[PDB]
Amino acid sequence: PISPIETVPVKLKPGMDGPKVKQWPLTEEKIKALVEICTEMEKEGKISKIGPENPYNTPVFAIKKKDSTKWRKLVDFRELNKRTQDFWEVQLGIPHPAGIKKNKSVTVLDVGDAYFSVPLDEDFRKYTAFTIPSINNETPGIRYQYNVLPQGWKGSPAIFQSSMTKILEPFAAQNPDIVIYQYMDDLYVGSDLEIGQHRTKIEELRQHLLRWGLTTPDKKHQKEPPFLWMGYELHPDKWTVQPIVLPEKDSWTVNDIQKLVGKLNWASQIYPGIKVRQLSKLLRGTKALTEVIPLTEEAELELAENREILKEPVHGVYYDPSKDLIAEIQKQGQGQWTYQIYQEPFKNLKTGKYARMRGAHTNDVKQLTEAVQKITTESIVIWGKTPKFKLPIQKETWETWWTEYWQATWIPEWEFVNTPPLVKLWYQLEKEPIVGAETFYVDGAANRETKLGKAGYVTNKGRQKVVPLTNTTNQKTELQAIYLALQDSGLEVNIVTDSQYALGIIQAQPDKSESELVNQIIEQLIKKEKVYLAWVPAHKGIGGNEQVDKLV
C-alpha cells in the first residue's frame, strides 16, 4: 500500500507554446535499438504511447558510449526547456568542507530508482512527446510521452530534489543525530554514534523510503570513503583539494597562465601562501588565448614558491561549533593579503587571499578593512558566524584611522597580532596651520592644446620657483607644484593649493598609487615632520595666489 508522491504543477512560459521540432531520419539499427529501450521503459511505467493528436514532437537520437555492445537513447529537450517556466533550483551554492561537522560513519544510498516514482505534471506530459521513426518510412512513427521527470529536462532536478526533501523532511526531523546530502542519484547520510546504531537507523530510513515504494540497492553503496566531490577529498575527519599540481613548461600561453591562476586560486582555499599577482600581470586586455606571452622573472620567482608549498599536501579539518572560530590575515605585498581561518593553532578549516580592488589609490588600512569584510561574509556563509580576527595593526593605529577617516568604518572583534610587516599610517596632515613654518602658495597649469604647462610656488620668505613642463595636464601640474613645495621645504611647512582635485588625492591619505608622481609626493610627505594642507578657491585673486606665473 504505497503513498503517492504529490505532483508538481508545471506550465510553460507566459504566452509561449510547445515544441514542433522536426524528427531527423535515423538508421535501421538505432531506430531498432530505440524500440528496444522505449518498450522496456513503458513496461516500467516511464513513458506511454500517444495518438495522432499530440503535435509536440521532440527530436530523439541514439548513442553508444565508446566501443560498446549497448545502445543509449538521447531525447534533446533544448526546445522544451526554453519554453518551460522557471524553477527554484536550490543549488545557488554548494557547501564548503570547512563548514561540515565530522561524521564517525557515513553511508550512501543510490536512488536512481526513486527518481522514477516522481510523476511528471499530468497536464504537462504532452509537451514531452517524441517519435521513433519507423523502418523504411512505410508506417507512422511510434509516438511516446513521459509520465516521469525526463533525464535532461529543465525542471527535472528542481522537482526531483524538492520531492525528495519533502519525503525526508519528517525523518531528519526525528533524527537530529544524522545528516543527509542529496547530491544526484546518491543519498549520503552521516551520523556520530556507535557503528551499530548507525546501520540500524539506516534501516529505520530504508524503511521510510519504502512507504513511498522507494526501493534502494541495499546500502551496498559500492562506494565508501574517500569521496571526490566538486574537487575535494573528504575523509572521516580531513579534507583537501584534489591533487592538481603546477605543470612544468616553457611554453606558457595566455591560456597556460590562465589555467594556472585558477589552480592556484582554487588551491588558495587550503594551501597557505598562494599568490597570483605577477601571473595576473600577464593578462589584462588580451583575448587570443594562443598568444604565448613571456613569464617575467617576477612571476617566475612566484611560480617557484608555489611549486614547493604545493609539494607537501596540507589538509583542512572539520568544523566543531563548540570551539572558537579564529581568522588571521597577513600583508603579502602589492595589494596582496592571505588569510587563514582556524579554531585551533595550525588546524586551518580553510585559508585564503585577497586581491586589492584595482583602484588608482588606496592604503594598507583600507585594504586590511576590505579583506576583513570579505572574510567576514564568507564566514557567515560557511559557519553562520563571524570569526575573531588576529590582525597586523596596532590598536592605536586603527583608532587614529577610523576616528579620522572621512568615511564610516568598522571591524568586528579583533586583536593585534605582531607578525611583521605591520600595517601602518605613513603620515598625517596637521589639522591647523604650523606657526613659524614657511608658507608655500603653489599652483600649476597646462595648456589644453599644446600640452605645455608650468608648475611652481611662491612663499612668504621670498622663495620662488616656476618650472616649465612638456606633455602634461592641468591636473598633473597641480600635483607637481605640490611636489616642488615639498622638495624645497624644511621639516615643517604649510602648503596652499587651489586644486580641489589635488587636495582630494591626499585627503584620502593613500600610501601607494599607480602614478609615480603621487608616490614621490608621498615619499616626500613621509620624510616631513609636520605638513598643513590648505585650500583656497581658485581665480578669486587671493593673497598668495598671484601665481599668474603658470598661466604664462
Q: Which residue is nearest to ligand T27 (CB)?
A: 229
Nearer to another protein, 39 or 165 (CB): 165
Q: How many CB atoms lie within 10 A of CB 272?
A: 16
Q: Which of 53, 48, 38, 55 is nearest to 127 (CA)?
A: 55
CB of 109 to ligand T27, least distance (A): 11
549 is in an annotated binding site: yes
CB of 508 to another protein, least distance (A): 6
Q: Which residues within the stretch 209-268 sit at the binding site for another protein (CB under 8 A)? A: none
Site for another protein contains 477 (CB under 8 A): no
Nearer to another protein, 261 or 503 (CB): 503
Applying CB under 8 A, the span of 66-74, 90-98, 250-258, 514-522 interacting with another protein comes to 90-98
Q: Which of 56, 339, 383, 414 binds another protein (CB under 8 A)?
A: 383
Cell digits for 63?
A: 548513442
Torsion of CA 373, 376, 380, 381, to 10 degrees: 70
Q: What is the DSSP secondary structure assignment for residue 122, as one 8-state letter?
A: G
CB of 228 to ligand T27, least distance (A): 7
Q: Which of 349, 508, 351, 487 is nearest to 425 (CA)?
A: 508
Cell 597586523 -> residue = 392
Cell 505534471 -> residue = 121
Q: Which of 348, 364, 487 is nearest to 426 (CA)?
A: 364
Nearer to another protein, 100 or 129 (CB): 100
CB of 541 to another protein, least distance (A): 6
Taking the C-alpha atoms of residue 518 and residue 504, their distance in angstroms, rounded to an integer, is: 12
Site for another protein contains 544 (CB under 8 A): yes
Nearer to another protein, 214 or 382 (CB): 382
Site size with another protein, rule: CB under 8 A? 75
226 binds, among another protein, ligand T27, none (CB under 5 to 8 A by kind): ligand T27
Which H or E run includes 73?
A: strand 72-75
**CA-angle at 148, arms to 203 and 219, nearest 5°:** 20
Q: What are the backbone angles phi and psi of residue 53, rounded to the nearest 5°?
A: -70, -75
Is beta strand 336-342 parallel, antiparallel or unpaired with respect to 453-459?
Answer: unpaired
Q: Which of 530, 354, 537 is nearest to 438 (CA)?
A: 530
Nearer to another protein, 87 or 232 (CB): 87
The binding track of 395-424 with respect to another protein, each residue x by CB under 8 A or -, is -------xxx-xxxxx--------------
478 is in an annotated binding site: yes
CB of 250 to ligand T27, least distance (A): 37
443 is in an annotated binding site: yes
532 binds, among ligand T27, another protein, none (CB under 5 to 8 A by kind): another protein
Site for another protein contains 543 (CB under 8 A): yes
* Per-position DSSP letters for 138-153, written without gaps between them: -SPPEEEEESB--TT-
Q: What is the DSSP secondary structure assignment for residue 112, as one 8-state letter?
A: T
503 binds, among another protein, ligand T27, none (CB under 5 to 8 A by kind): another protein
Q: Which residues within the stretch 494-523 sit at the binding site for another protein (CB under 8 A)? A: 494, 496, 500, 503-504, 507-508
Taking the C-alpha atoms of residue 60 and residue 144, their distance in angstroms, rounded to an integer, is: 11
User: Using an 8 Å Cβ cutoff, are 510 and 361 in contact?
Assistant: yes
Nearer to ligand T27, 72 or 323 (CB): 323
Nearer to another protein, 248 or 396 (CB): 396
Q: How many CB atoms lie within 10 A of CB 266?
A: 15
Q: Which residues within the stretch 153-212 sit at the binding site for another protein (CB under 8 A)? A: 155, 158-159, 161-162, 165, 179, 181
Taking the C-alpha atoms of residue 380 and residue 397, their distance in angstroms, rounded to an integer, is: 27
Q: Which of 11, 13, 23, 17 is nearest to 57 (CA)?
A: 23
CB of 230 to another protein, least distance (A): 12
Name the H helices within 70-212: 78-81, 156-174, 195-208
498 is in an annotated binding site: yes
Name the H helices within 260-317: 261-267, 297-309
User: Using an 8 Å Cβ cutoff, are 375 and 387 in contact?
Assistant: yes
Applying CB under 8 A, the span of 59-67, 331-339, 378-386, 468-476 interacting with another protein comes to 378-386
Site for another protein contains 152 (CB under 8 A): no
CB of 349 to another protein, least distance (A): 12
Site for another protein contains 390 (CB under 8 A): no
86 is in an annotated binding site: no
User: Three-state DSSP class for 207?
Assistant: helix
Taking the C-alpha atoms of residue 118 and residue 127, their distance in angstroms, rounded to an integer, is: 17
103 binds, among another protein, ligand T27, none (CB under 5 to 8 A by kind): ligand T27
Buried-state track 98-111, b at ≥16 Cβ within 10 A, e below 16:
bbbebbebbbbbbb
Q: Which residues within the stretch 430-469 sit at the binding site for another protein (CB under 8 A)? A: 432-436, 438-439, 441, 458-460
Nearer to ligand T27, 101 or 388 (CB): 101
Q: Which of 210, 491, 542, 551 binds another protein (CB under 8 A)?
A: 542
CB of 552 to another protein, least distance (A): 17
CB of 208 to ligand T27, least distance (A): 17
Q: Which burial class, exposed, middle or buried, applies to 148 when counting CB atoms under 10 A from its CB (0-12, 13-18, 19+)?
A: buried
Which H or E run includes 99?
A: none
Site for another protein contains 102 (CB under 8 A): no
Q: Which of 279, 328, 286 is nearest to 304 (CA)?
A: 279
Q: Which of 105, 363, 369, 489 binds another protein (CB under 8 A)?
A: 369
Contacts with ligand T27 by CB under 6 A lie at 95, 100-103, 106, 179, 181, 183, 188, 190, 225-227, 229, 234-236
**Residue ranges for the binding site?**
110, 185-186, 443, 478, 498, 549
**Residue ranges for the binding site for Mg(2+)?**
110, 185-186, 443, 478, 498, 549
